[PDB]
Amino acid sequence: IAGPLIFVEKTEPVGYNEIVNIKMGDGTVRRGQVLDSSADIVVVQVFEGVIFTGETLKLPASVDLLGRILSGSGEPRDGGPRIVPDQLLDINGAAMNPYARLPPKDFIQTGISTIDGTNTLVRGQKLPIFSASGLPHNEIALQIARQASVPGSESAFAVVFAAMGITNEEAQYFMSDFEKTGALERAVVFLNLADDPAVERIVTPRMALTAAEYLAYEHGMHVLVILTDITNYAEALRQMGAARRGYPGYMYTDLATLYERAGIVKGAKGSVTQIPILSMHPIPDLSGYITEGQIVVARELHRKGIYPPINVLPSLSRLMNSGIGAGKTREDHKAVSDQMYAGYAEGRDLRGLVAIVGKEALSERDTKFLEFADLFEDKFVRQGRNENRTIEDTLEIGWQILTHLPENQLGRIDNKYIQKYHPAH
Amino acid sequence: AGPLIFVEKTEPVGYNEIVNIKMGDGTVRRGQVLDSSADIVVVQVFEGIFTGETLKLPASVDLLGRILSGSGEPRDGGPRIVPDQLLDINGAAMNPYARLPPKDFIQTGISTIDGTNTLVRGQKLPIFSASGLPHNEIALQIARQASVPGSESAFAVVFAAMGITNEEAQYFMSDFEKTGALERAVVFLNLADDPAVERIVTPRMALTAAEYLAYEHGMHVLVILTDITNYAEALRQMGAPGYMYTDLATLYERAGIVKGAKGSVTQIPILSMPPIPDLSGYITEGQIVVARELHRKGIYPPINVLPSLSRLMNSGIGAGKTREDHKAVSDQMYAGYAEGRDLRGLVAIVGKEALSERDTKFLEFADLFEDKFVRQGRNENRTIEDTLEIGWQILTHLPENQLGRIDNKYIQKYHPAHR
Ligand SMILES: Nc1ncnc2c1ncn2[C@@H]1O[C@H](COP(=O)(O)OP(=O)(O)O)[C@@H](O)[C@H]1O
């Protein structure tokens, strides 16, 4: 009803509104009120002495997590045996602070040009996929899961895919796609089904993040966290206890408990990077999750039959400068990125000019820019479902379609880079 | 086939109807009838009987101070059209755009805009919101407050509203009337019922009028387009080529510095939620986000700066533009606020007193920023100097050696701890 909202391990019968004490991993006890509970997990609303004192819900932490498929509670879903831990970690983020005071940094290679090329994802970043209902955002996100890597990083890489409020059909789809490609081998998957207890859905993200932190910090790994639907999560939030539409007031604080949990870790040798998926009667503000930019799925592109239907003009990466350039990608990266962006906007603008003046009333120059916005979409943006591009290959594509423009018309690439890189030099 | 145009309906006409049209140019083109309305025929022209003239706005400097009606006719009971130009509406009218980049400052008097996501002369900066949020209120404030300090050209506002209620229209009228704002503005109002072909011509009527004033009169013109979503809704309610994605393009292409460089057309389109559409095409030079979270907190104007962005900001700010420290103060507030909002997550999870002293001063700053920089009176017009001074004000609350983003030159000079 008012939050903050922590997750306790239903160990003995609780009642609604019960005042309970929660004993943190720290050794300190926080007072709170029972909000709601499933059958194994209790949801408490904290405040800040012979009453119930409960244990904080914990993740069976282990390297053995990799290659396993679990439910929202982190209970085995693959037929495998239960998870033998060596670390029971407080799921609420409140036991370890793995996060260092360091800006997010190096390159993560998604294999997707409209990401790696112009909206580069950086290690320790939060970069959501802004989509809507009916677009292949899940297809994107699991392509990203099959393909992401950290070129030349001596820290190993892992992915934590978490899917919430999903159907049995699409459950079966992820499980098969993760196993038969091999992407599962380096991944811990948490699948919450639209069916499973509302509550279990809500811990799903805190389970996923907690895990990510374990691999990042205590095993020196780069972990990419992918969360299929933050709107599905919000919905679950608006159906807790007392709740006549709209969303709780503590939603905003709550989401912040999710998006505070990312970055480079103490010791610099690992990191947590987030790619939340934001889809779209109810009108959820998930604004706070968008502080480093966002990647944008455009129905327009979807309609022309373009996959992935990513629109770079609205897309953004605020930390892209920290992950590109010499010894990270290549020096011409900013240049190519800037020039394509500039050139695609121009050609996109000119599609309007066309339908004002008529096609034949366009200047030679303009027709080249109009033809480029085309080449950009068909050759750059379009990319197979299982087509993993090196940034090298992505930057080359950029250059190949930039050739279509007048060389005197590349005000974003210093002669330094045209001389060295341009396919006619 | 080819481009859409708009013609005066001399008489009734069918469909797929081959017709002759007299452009403002003087050349005659043929096409077909897309949609027979009442006052206006939508034509699909050929190569880039019935005798018709293209619909055109009576372009004249006396458009200023007039409240018109999307169709171009008067709504303020004022006298009729007083032509000086008679210009086509589609965008062909003047070919007035000097292909140059946006370059100077537009002072909206709104700190979350001016200070953090600066609006540059010649920019398209879509304000992005949802229903239930006061975007029209912001749009309306910008209309009366907007100015171009240090510009030796005249400033002018073109406000165009689509698919609005009577009450809204009356509100907008009085507001323009009483606040002395209309004295510098052209206002096109389209009611949510009058019919639809008319909602469509609205923006084109506005932009032609803007292009007229900017190009042919050396003015800097802000075009506030209030609700592209309404526009989109009317666009599907009709016809069966120029098809929304392409059609918006005819809209978002119409901005920039004009030839001569002695003027500009700047455009602020309102984009709301929640049915269709995809109007991302309008987003290329930034966006200003209106957040419901901030609104359910009782803050006006409810702009979240973190997701907001102006891609062209660096061209509007600095030395002879605003002030030298602008970018430093703007970055440090962005970094300080971003940080404080995350620590709200942290506080929830660990507890207020579990939190570091430094982290606490950041958490407290996120509050000062929302309470003092963002919160602003419906009718308070903040100079950029006002905007920057309250910045430095709330900055003081941060431990001086935590201001990474500001070079010592500006700290030693502007920081209040040492005047
Ligand atoms: N932080 C953000 N918050 C909200 N929208 C954003 C943000 N960043 C970019 N956008 C853009 O907002 C658009 C969503 O609106 P869209 O569906 O295109 O139009 P509308 O919602 O008006 O129908 C996306 O195209 C996206 O690029």
UniProtKB/Swiss-Prot annotation, chain A:
An example Gene Ontology biological process: proton motive force-driven plasma membrane ATP synthesis
CDD domains: ATP-synt_V_A-type_beta_C, ATP-synt_V_A-type_beta_N, V_A-ATPase_B
Membrane topology, record value: Peripheral membrane protein
One Pfam family this sequence matches: ATP-synt_ab
Keywords: ATP synthesis, Cell membrane, Hydrogen ion transport, Ion transport, Membrane, Transport
The keyword Acetylation belongs to this UniProt entry's keyword annotation: no
Record GO cellular component, one term: plasma membrane
Signal peptide: none
pH curve summary: Optimum pH is 5.2 for ATP hydrolysis.
Miscellaneous information on this protein: This organism has both a Na(+)-translocating F1F0 ATP synthase and this H(+)-translocating A1A0 ATP synthase.
Function description: Component of the A-type ATP synthase that produces ATP from ADP in the presence of a proton gradient across the membrane. The B chain is a regulatory subunit.
Family listed: Belongs to the ATPase alpha/beta chains family.
PANTHER family the record matches: V-TYPE PROTON ATPASE SUBUNIT B
Protein's name according to its UniProt entry: A-type ATP synthase subunit B
